[PDB]
């Protein structure tokens, strides 16, 4: 037996036996944690809308 995080693929399932998945997963996105952006030149008008 092999206890490893093996993706259940078609080519693998045809040659080996896969049980029910023990975790759900998918494709996600990496971005940096939002840093504090430098204030704009005319940012003193921000409190009131244009």
């Amino acid at each position: 037996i092999a206890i490893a995080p093996l993706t259940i693929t078609l080519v693998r399932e045809e040659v080996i036996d896969f049980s029910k998945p023990f975790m759900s997963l998918g494709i996600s996105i990496m971005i940096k944690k939002p840093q504090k952006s430098k204030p704009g030149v005319f940012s003193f008008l921000d409190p009131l809308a244009y």
């Binding site: 037996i1 092999a2 206890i3 490893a4 995080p5």
Partner: protein, 32 residues
């Protein structure tokens, strides 16, 4: 009987113990 539980080294699935020099058997590996 003894079953060979083969596994791959992947994070965070299997860590390599930092004090495994004197460890033997199943105690070397710990992880998911």
């Amino acid at each position: 009987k003894t079953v060979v539980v083969t596994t791959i080294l992947e994070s965070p699935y299997v860590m390599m113990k930092k004090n495994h020099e004197m460890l033997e058997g199943n105690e070397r590996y710990e992880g998911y």
